[PDB]
Design a binder for this molecule. Structure first.
Ligand SMILES: Nc1ncnc2c1ncn2[C@@H]1O[C@H](COP(=O)(O)OP(=O)(O)O)[C@@H](O)[C@H]1O
Ligand SMILES: Nc1ncnc2c1ncn2[C@@H]1O[C@H](COP(=O)(O)OP(=O)(O)O)[C@@H](O)[C@H]1O
Lengths: 359, 359
């Protein structure tokens, strides 16, 4: 039936960015953007991502991708548009102070008292400061990218679930009855986030080693400022936002295929946080007293706690964003836990390659 | 709950254009575009509209609106974008030749033989030529407008039915279960096309005299060119397109509230055309033999024939596009049978007024 040169599945930060770069790299190549949710999609990972760009999230060898992504952020993708991005130093609080060029927490939080009251200076005396860290809303980044892509002639299909079939895509909708509709495509970019691996598996039998982890983002209602630095401890992050802090748990491991997030087992009372997060908090309460006061919103059940599924490339919690061609014309785009520092770069790199194999 | 300064209901040619002009006139005023179909929507009137701009469709006093709309068309709304628009003269074939500055069909179709074989020069000797007529695809116009509006920060909501409530809008969706969601709005533009009058009636008890007519656009598979002029006879139009002609029936009157298009009663055989169109054809077959040959696609039932509902302002088949504020902050935007010559103008006029009352 109808056909497109390029079909991008997924309108989150990754797919939206990739569709944008492809519209500027290959404007003569028709592109269709398919998203099963809306635009934006508050049921996705991109919306809850803390949006922290930090030199501490750059794996060895990825300095080029990290800086290019940073430049894009401050330049709003070079679209003459507005993208709220503030300069906010990031501190990696540490116990026994001894090693590389660290900084005494006492001095680091000199003009930031609202961040001091959260911890215990004695149990976290030193830190690794990153003066170039930045904060932004991934949701705004993604929307901006989608908008610009659409303003550039990108086909748009929302509230549509894409299914991969040999040669093209099958689109499912709802009018009440289903509406299946196939379409040919020369190139298909799978930017379904954490759902990307399964998509290609159940659709084309293409096996991968990628995994997925469910991460919650409970809020900490304690005084915060527009310039109060991002803080990290034992892998946990305190992202100042909306006058408070958003707690970004560490991912210790991938979650199994058959797993339903439940959480709730704190000192004899059922909460909305997973057992693992609960344990982490208990282990950080002394160092970060704020985790033991009235600030943290624990909720009653997992339903009251903001959460999302993030892809884990290769199943590694610390693996960066990446792309790969699993078959002729078929690419799998993965963002992941480091997408805030390396996300755009991986979408642009994929766009360049796709654009070339078309010229 | 959540609120917007401006909410535009309907993403067809009218709503899409209005949302575009509002984004440029009042960029600082948030705007949400709601459409129950997709983008584009091939289930709307805009998609089937012949897109004919002709000085013969300008009612007295509407010359300013007509020319402004024409300028927008050739300039693609001034968006530096591409909008296919060709120069195509329009001929209003007439019987007894005698009156204003007419032109002998024989000379008018001098270099256009493929248009001559459709009629009988004797029964239609003279015509009223319009050298400034233009043809374009309303669908492309609308999409372009929506795209540009989105690239300008216009909120977008598709596959969502809007319902007017005191103060704001109620949004219905489908995930399988319904999802009602209200939103406050300072200004609400009702660009639901033919469904606009009922919308406000069943939602706010606001009575109007506007009507609706169902018009079909059967195709005539006979030789056509990129420069073959648009032809009209006894109110019927032959719009050259895709190597053929699209038949644009005349609207003699409005269709009643409880009316289901059926059609099909030609010389003892059931077809897909309404009785009225059938009669018109019979009355034009002599003058336009092409209507009696193998060219016309009659179909078996109305389901096989391209059709759409068009609003009739004031219930008058020949009334132009218009807007009105039926209540504080509530506007009803109507396109209609003359939207190809006056549509943009009415959407821009409404945008200016809405923008001013906000400033
Ligand atoms: N099979 C599917 N068909 C269409 N769209 C999909 C499908 N599965 C997921 N999506 C969309 O893919 C998008 C990616 O969002 P997200 O998880 O944030 O990706 P990422 O974080 O990698 O940018 C999601 O927003 C989701 O709405
Ligand atoms: N109540 C509704 N809620 C949301 N969208 C609507 C509703 N009713 C109609 N629409 C949309 O309003 C749009 C107008 O399309 P159209 O009929 O071509 O308007 P017009 O011809 O005046 O530009 C339609 O495309 C339709 O999809």
């Amino acid at each position: 039936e109808e056909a497109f040169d390029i079909v991008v599945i997924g309108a989150g930060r990754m797919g939206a960015a990739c569709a944008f770069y492809l519209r500027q790299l290959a404007p003569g190549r028709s592109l269709l953007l398919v998203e099963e949710g809306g635009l934006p999609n508050e049921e996705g990972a991109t919306i809850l991502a803390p949006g922290v760009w930090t030199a501490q999230d750059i794996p060895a060898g990825q300095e080029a991708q990290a800086e290019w992504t940073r430049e894009q952020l401050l330049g709003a993708l070079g679209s003459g548009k507005t993208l709220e991005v503030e300069d906010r130093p990031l501190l990696h609080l540490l116990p026994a102070g001894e090693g590389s060029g660290l900084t005494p927490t006492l001095d680091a939080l000199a003009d930031f008292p609202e961040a001091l009251a959260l911890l215990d200076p004695a149990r976290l005396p030193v830190a690794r400061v990153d003066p170039r860290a930045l904060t932004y809303r991934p949701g705004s980044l993604a929307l901006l990218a989608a908008q610009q892509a659409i303003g550039q002639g990108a086909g748009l299909l929302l509230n549509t679930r894409a299914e991969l079939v040999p040669g093209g895509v099958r689109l499912h909708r709802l009018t009440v009855v289903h509406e299946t509709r196939q379409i040919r495509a020369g190139v298909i970019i799978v930017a379904a986030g954490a759902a990307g691996p399964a998509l290609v598996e159940q659709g084309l039998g293409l096996h991968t080693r990628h995994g997925r982890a469910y991460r919650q983002f409970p809020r900490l209602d304690l005084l915060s400022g527009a310039q109060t630095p991002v803080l990290r401890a034992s892998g946990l992050t305190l992202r100042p936002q909306n006058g408070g802090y958003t707690l970004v748990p560490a991912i210790h491991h991938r979650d199994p295929h058959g797993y339903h997030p439940a959480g709730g087992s704190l000192t004899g009372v059922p909460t909305g946080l997973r057992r693992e997060l609960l344990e982490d908090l208990v282990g950080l309460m002394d160092a970060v007293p704020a985790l033991a006061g009235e600030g943290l919103e624990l909720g009653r059940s997992s339903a009251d706690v903001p959460g999302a599924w993030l892809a884990l490339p290769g199943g590694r919690p610390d693996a960066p964003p990446q792309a790969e061609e699993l078959a002729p014309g078929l690419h799998l785009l993965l963002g992941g836990p480091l997408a805030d520092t390396l996300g755009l770069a991986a979408a642009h790199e994929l766009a360049q390659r796709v654009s070339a194999s078309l010229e």
